[PDB]
Amino acid sequence: EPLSILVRNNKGRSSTYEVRLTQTVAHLKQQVSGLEGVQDDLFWLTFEGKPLEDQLPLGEYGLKPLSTVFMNLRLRG
């Protein structure tokens, strides 16, 4: 069943994403990569202080409607 969650970017702006709890963290990263225009190997996600692992389904983390996930940038230079 589809639900909406929020992903907050580096600037502090949250955007809404339709997801399913069966999809992987990696696939959520692909959606965030498309919306934010940042390569998916240049950020990682967290929820409630826990890193999200790419291969795991979202449901392993207990996301709920309008939970906020952080998009944490990898910065190089």
Binding site: D41, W44, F70, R76, G77
Partner: protein, 162 residues
Amino acid sequence: GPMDFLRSLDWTQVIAGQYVSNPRFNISDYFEIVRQPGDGNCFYHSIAELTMPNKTDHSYHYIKRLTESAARKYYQEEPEARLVGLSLEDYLKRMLSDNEWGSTLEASMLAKEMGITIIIWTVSDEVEAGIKFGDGDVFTAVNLLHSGQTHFDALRILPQFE
């Protein structure tokens, strides 16, 4: 109060020991920018500038040595390690190469290894975010400026703010 903006930065936990802030200010209103060489070692040049008193032109080699030591302990458990996608040995060969760009991953590991707190301010010089590695505040932090998506400089708090 007057002149005490830096005393009230609000840091939100990302994971234990890493935080983010989104204050609105221009870097040059509160910091001196200590420009670093444009070569690929600028991240480590910047760290050396702020941690090694009366340093030499290439004191950054010591910081890269500390990065190696840190990686041997911490690399496998760093969430950003997964983004790099290399074994520890392949990571070290790449990281130790001259001109190989440093990053938030090395900041995370060096904060642990050296016991310092590092803040990377990303940006005009209008701040978008500060990302903090370690539990210290801005006044004893190693403050770095990340600009143009590809460049690091060192920052020093301007004297009137302490």
